[PDB]
């Protein structure tokens, strides 16, 4: 783990206030001593840190996105079709009504399935694959430090996760996403 | 591991030596099934897939005379359906059944290990004498594409009412 | 529950009088749904 | 048709509808209206006209007296008013007896029949409950196979 | 005690074998795996049922289109075997056919080399419609939730 | 000591976790009267007729064989209008499948006399899927809960119908709450 003891392993607490729980080992990335209601009894290891990995790429891509569209910013042609709307429910319920989610949603799909269940299902029957690894570095990034990358990857994907529910919620509220 | 899916582990019913195998099977039907089954049933759609895509080219480069005015000018299954009720896809289906008896006995002798799984023997020509597995992988990876291509010239047909050609002329 | 429980529930009277009611039951809601049947339909 | 008039055309069984709906409409007379006796009266006259009119559909045959009336010869015309509900009775009555049967030999090979046939053992009892289904087969095998009819010298006698 | 529904007649004080027959592990299609006289399998074996069934399927080919086939009206006309006169047999003069083995005329059933022909065909009829699972014309149960939330007393 | 899926109450005796799906589950102690292999042979039955019960349900709703008397979307209304003498037909064949597949041994007094016979196994494998022993525990674990979802759906399935009125899927499409 990159900064073993300092920032994430055993003995590691980002919040004092509850204790870190003897089931958080600080075997895995982004253990940080946070588990108050004792999950990590119980359920499958493997199994939630992949969830959360898979979690927190959604989300930062969910953001990207979200801003973007906010922003105004949008593909040659994207506006003909779907709209000029920058609210991004009624772009959601227009690339829905076009056909555009679907089609995102098919493929999504497929890949869970040919690619991230067979993959979850090998890493719960032992096959020793790190959680939240497809072997996707085309660019090589994560050849000098895939641990200090790991840990980078899962913090700004917990941010990124709060900051979009944050988003969607001040977007309810104010008509913005940013909520000032 | 596998080479098309890195991160995945090989399948353990795909040893490699079959044309076309990449280690491809992320869903693990080779797990469930017999993989002779599944390889004659890939090959049997690979030629029927090229053999259906070169015919919706070819129809709609060129008709025969007297099949056009069967089938009034319909295209791809609506001249299925015409030439239905012509009585010419029931001499097709009667004489593929006919050689399709014969292909379940080759099925079962595949299955009992006497035979390579789509090999009837057929190579008048002689074409595959020199790398038959070459010919093999061509043979596998032009069936996946011309299973494919079909899919896409159907739905295409589906869609618009015009064949492969016309759409792309009218896109 | 206790098996000298059990045992009394399986004795013959208890286990009369439950059947006889369930038959009783059977019968009556039957009739309940099905009334004036004075025939097999056909 | 036997000797008898349908039912359905016969002024008496008419007439009888008629009686039995006057009679509960003079007791609704008394009544409120939407009060529970008058709901009930009034249920009352829909379930008897109910019953009139399907019995004037099922084919029964009626007398002078205006009462449907039975033929149980065989005819296969009238089969659904005595023998198909006599071979649903058959069929239980049979099953009753076979599971019943079973039991008792059941219990007379234990450590204590007389036990078992006051304090059952309900497990084996519903196990031959749900045995009794193909009672008919299973019976002619017994009897076959001679587990069922016991022989003349095995059986007490009183003397002559 | 006794446990119930033990499948032993034994246990039951019922009639049963006293040896009982070895199941062997061999299958046929559109058959059951179970004990079978020596060389059953190997004689009709998933081969024999398979080769069979394609046999019948294509004889059915012939058989569902049954009927006497003419041109010389200058069309193709097809005219029932039942028609056709049989010299030698008495009063029947018309005698009994493939069609009644295969009476689909009868039923108004258009049968095919295929099973389904035409006038008799598989019926697919979409259920989606114009519905869609939420902010559609058509009120779904996602719609429903929708209201139920956003509602006003 | 104590049941996994029930904590409070203790674990089942007769219940030793050899058969699949078995996490404890038997608040009322069915097993201990009852034997285990005809209650997995009857749980199995039930959840393959449920299971061809929900597909029915749901593809006759979209694709019907050709005639008046098989089109009927709503399956209660299929029922009754599918012919009689047909449904008969299918009652018979049942019954002769019943009597064929168990080798006349039908009933609770000689249903496993041959110990060969396993509770379930009615020797169909017509494709002979179930020969490979690593996947026949995973192929067993699937078909049971996949038995017990379809009995639940079946179950909901026929009631929603009862009171609804409408198909299944026409109802999710167009659902109006009830009311009386
Ligand atoms: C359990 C774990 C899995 C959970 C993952 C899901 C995580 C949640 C993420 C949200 C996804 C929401 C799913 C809702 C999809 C929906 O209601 O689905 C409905 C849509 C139906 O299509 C939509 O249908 C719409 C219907 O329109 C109607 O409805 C619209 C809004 O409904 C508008 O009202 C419009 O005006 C009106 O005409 C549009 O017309 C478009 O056709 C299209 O947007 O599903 C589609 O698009 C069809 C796409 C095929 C589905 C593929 C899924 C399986 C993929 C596996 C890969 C194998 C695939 C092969
Ligand atoms: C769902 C979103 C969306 C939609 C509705 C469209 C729609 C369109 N795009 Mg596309 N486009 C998209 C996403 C989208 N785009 C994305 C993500 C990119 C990458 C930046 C592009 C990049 C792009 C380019 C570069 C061009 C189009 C063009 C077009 C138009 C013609 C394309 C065609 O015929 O097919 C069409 C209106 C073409 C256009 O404007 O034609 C004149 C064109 O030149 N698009
Ligand atoms: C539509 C296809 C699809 C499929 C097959 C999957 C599959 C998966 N997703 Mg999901 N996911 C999808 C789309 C899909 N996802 C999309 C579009 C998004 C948003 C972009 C996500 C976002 C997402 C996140 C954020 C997470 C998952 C997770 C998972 C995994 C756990 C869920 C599971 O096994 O449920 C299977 C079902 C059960 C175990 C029992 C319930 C049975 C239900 C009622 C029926 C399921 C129906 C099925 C999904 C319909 C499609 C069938 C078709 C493919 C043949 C699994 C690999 C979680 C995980 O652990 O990932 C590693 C996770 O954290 N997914
Ligand atoms: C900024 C966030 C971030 C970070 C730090 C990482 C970090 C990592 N990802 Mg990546 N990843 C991200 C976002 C990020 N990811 C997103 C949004 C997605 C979804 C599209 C993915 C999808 C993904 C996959 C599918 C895989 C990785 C993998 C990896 C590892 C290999 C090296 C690499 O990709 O470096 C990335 C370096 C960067 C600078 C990325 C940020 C680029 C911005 C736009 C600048 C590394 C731990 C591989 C692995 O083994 O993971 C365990 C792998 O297989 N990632
Ligand atoms: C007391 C004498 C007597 C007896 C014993 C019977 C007995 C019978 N009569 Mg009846 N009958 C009687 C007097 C009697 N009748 C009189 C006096 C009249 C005139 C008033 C009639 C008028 C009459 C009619 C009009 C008919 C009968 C028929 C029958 C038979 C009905 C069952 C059957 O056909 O099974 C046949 C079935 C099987 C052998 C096996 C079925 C197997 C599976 C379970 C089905 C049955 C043998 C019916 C019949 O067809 O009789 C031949 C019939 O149509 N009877
Ligand atoms: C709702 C109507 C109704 C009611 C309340 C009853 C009530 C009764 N019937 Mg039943 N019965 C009915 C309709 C009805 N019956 C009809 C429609 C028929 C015509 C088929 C019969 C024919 C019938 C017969 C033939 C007998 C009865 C007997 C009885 C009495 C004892 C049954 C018994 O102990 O069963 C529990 C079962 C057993 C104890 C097992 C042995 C007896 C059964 C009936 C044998 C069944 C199978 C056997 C092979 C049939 C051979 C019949 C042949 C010899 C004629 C009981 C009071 C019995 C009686 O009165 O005996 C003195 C009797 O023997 N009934
Ligand atoms: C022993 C042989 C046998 C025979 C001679 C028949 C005869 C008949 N069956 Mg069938 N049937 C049989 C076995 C048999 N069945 C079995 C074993 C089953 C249970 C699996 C059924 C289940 C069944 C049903 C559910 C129905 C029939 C119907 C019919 C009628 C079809 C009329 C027609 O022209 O259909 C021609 C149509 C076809 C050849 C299409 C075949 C479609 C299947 C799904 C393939 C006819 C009386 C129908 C009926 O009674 O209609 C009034 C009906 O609804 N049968
Ligand atoms: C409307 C729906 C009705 C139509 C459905 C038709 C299906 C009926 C099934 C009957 C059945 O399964 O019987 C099961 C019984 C088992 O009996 C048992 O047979 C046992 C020995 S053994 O099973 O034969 O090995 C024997 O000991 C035991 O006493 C006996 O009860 O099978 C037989 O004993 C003989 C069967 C008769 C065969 C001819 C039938 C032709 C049709
Ligand atoms: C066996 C044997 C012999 C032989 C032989 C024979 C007869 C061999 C015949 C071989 C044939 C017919 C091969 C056909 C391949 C077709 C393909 C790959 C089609 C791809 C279509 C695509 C990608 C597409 C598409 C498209 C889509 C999707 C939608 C469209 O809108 C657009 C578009 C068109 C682009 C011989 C006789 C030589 C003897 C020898 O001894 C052995
Ligand atoms: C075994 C075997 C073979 C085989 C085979 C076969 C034919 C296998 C077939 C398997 C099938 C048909 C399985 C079906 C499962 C259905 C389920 C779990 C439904 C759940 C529904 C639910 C939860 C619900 C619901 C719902 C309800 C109630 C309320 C609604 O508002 C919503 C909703 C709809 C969601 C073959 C022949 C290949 C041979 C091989 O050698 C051996
Ligand atoms: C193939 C030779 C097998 C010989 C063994 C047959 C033994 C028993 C045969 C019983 C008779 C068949 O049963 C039959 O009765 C029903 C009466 O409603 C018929 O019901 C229907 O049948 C016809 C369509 O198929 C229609 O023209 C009828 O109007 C209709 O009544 C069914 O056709 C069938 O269910």
Same mark, same amino acid.
């Given at each position: 783990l990159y900064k073993e003891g300092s920032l994430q392993g055993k003995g590691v607490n980002c919040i004092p206030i509850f204790k870190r729980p003897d089931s958080l080992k600080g075997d895995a990335v982004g253990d940080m001593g946070f588990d108050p209601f004792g999950f990590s009894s119980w359920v499958d290891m493997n199994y939630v840190r992949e969830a959360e990995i898979k979690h927190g790429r959604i989300a930062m891509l969910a953001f990207a996105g979200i801003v973007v569209e906010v922003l105004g910013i949008k593909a040659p042609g994207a506006g003909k079709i779907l709209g000029s709307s920058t609210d991004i429910f009624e772009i959601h319920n227009a690339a829905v009504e076009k056909g555009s989610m679907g089609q995102i949603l098919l493929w999504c799909g497929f890949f869970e399935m040919t690619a991230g269940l067979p993959a979850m299902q090998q890493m719960l029957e032992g096959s020793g694959r790190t959680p939240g690894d497809f072997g996707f570095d085309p660019l090589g990034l994560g050849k000098k430090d895939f641990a200090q990358m790991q840990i980078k990857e899962i913090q700004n994907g917990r941010l990124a996760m709060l900051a979009v529910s944050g988003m969607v919620h001040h977007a309810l509220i104010n008509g913005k996403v940013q909520g000032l | 591991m596998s080479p098309s899916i890195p991160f995945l582990k090989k399948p353990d019913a795909l040893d490699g030596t079959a044309a076309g195998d990449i280690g491809f099977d992320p869903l693990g039907f080779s797990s469930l099934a017999d993989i002779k089954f599944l390889q004659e049933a890939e090959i049997k759609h690979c030629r029927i897939a090229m053999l259906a895509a070169a015919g919706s080219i070819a129809q709609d480069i060129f008709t025969f005379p007297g099949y056009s005015a069967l089938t009034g000018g319909a295209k791809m299954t609506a001249a299925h359906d015409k030439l239905v009720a012509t009585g010419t896809m029931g001499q097709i289906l009667f004489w593929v059944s006919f050689a399709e008896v014969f292909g379940t006995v080759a099925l079962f002798d595949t299955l009992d290990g006497k035979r390579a799984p789509?090999? !009837?023997? !057929?190579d008048p020509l002689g074409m595959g004498k020199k790398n038959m597995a070459d010919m093999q992988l061509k043979e596998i990876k032009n069936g996946r594409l011309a299973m494919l291509g079909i899919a896409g010239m159907t739905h295409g047909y589906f869609i618009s009412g015009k064949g492969p050609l016309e759409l792309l002329g009218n896109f | 529950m206790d098996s000298n429980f059990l045992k009394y529930l399986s004795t013959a009277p208890v286990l009369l009088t439950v059947w006889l009611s369930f038959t009783a039951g059977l019968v009556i809601e039957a009739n309940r749904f099905f009334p004036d049947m004075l025939y097999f339909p056909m | 048709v036997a000797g008898l008039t349908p039912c359905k055309d016969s002024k008496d069984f008419q007439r009888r509808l008629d009686g039995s709906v006057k009679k509960l409409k003079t007791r609704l007379a008394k009544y409120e209206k939407g009060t529970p006796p008058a709901l009930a009266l009034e249920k009352q006259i829909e379930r008897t006209q109910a019953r009139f009119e399907r019995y004037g559909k099922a084919g029964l045959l009626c007398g002078t007296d205006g009462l449907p009336h039975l033929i149980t010869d065989g005819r296969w015309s009238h089969s659904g008013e005595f023998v198909i509900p006599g071979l649903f009775f058959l069929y239980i009555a049979g099953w009753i007896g076979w599971v019943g049967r079973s039991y008792v030999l059941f219990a007379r090979e234990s450590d204590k029949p007389t036990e078992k046939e006051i304090i059952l053992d309900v497990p084996a009892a519903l196990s031959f409950v749900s045995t009794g289904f193909i009672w008919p087969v299973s019976a002619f095998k017994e009897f076959t196979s001679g587990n069922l009819i016991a022989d003349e010298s095995e059986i007490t006698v009183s003397p002559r | 005690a006794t446990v119930g529904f033990?499948?032993?007649?034994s246990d039951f004080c019922r009639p049963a074998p006293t040896a009982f027959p070895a199941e062997p592990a061999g299958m046929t299609v559109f058959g059951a795996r179970g004990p079978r006289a020596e060389g059953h399998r190997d004689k009709f074996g998933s081969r024999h049922a398979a080769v069979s069934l394609a046999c019948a399927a294509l004889l059915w080919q012939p058989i569902s289109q049954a009927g006497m086939y003419?041109?010389?009206?200058?069309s193709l006309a097809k005219k029932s075997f039942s028609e056709m006169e049989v010299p030698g047999f008495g009063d029947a003069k018309k005698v009994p056919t493939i069609e009644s083995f295969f009476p689909f005329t009868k039923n108004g059933f258009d049968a095919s080399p295929a099973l389904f022909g035409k006038d008799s065909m598989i019926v697919f009829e979409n259920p989606?419609?114009?519905?869609? &699972?939420? &902010?559609?014309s058509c009120h779904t149960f996602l719609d429903e939730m929708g209201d139920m939330l956003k509602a006003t007393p | 000591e104590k049941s996994a899926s029930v904590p409070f109450l203790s674990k089942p005796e007769k219940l030793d976790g050899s058969m699949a799906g078995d996490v404890g589950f038997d608040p009322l102690g069915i097993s201990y009267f009852i034997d285990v292999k005809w209650l997995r042979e009857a749980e199995l039955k039930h959840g393959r007729i449920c299971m061809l019960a929900t597909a029915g349900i749901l593809v006759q709703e979209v694709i019907h064989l050709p005639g008046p008397a098989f089109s009927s979307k709503f399956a209660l209304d299929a029922w009754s209008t599918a012919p009689r003498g047909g449904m008969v037909q299918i009652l018979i064949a049942i019954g002769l499948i019943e009597m064929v597949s168990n080798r006349f041994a039908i009933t609770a007094t000689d249903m496993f006399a041959n110990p060969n016979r396993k509770p379930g196994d009615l020797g169909f494998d017509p494709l002979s899927l179930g020969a490979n022993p690593a996947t026949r525990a995973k192929y067993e674990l699937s078909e049971v809960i996949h038995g017990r979802a379809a009995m639940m759906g079946l179950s909901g399935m026929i009631h929603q119908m009862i009171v609804s009125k409408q198909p299944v899927i026409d109802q999710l499409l167009n659902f109006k709450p009830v009311d009386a």
């Open positions: - | 789509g090999d !009837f023997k !057929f | - | - | 033990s499948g032993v007649p003419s041109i010389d009206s200058g989606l419609g114009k519905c869609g &699972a939420y &902010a559609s | -």
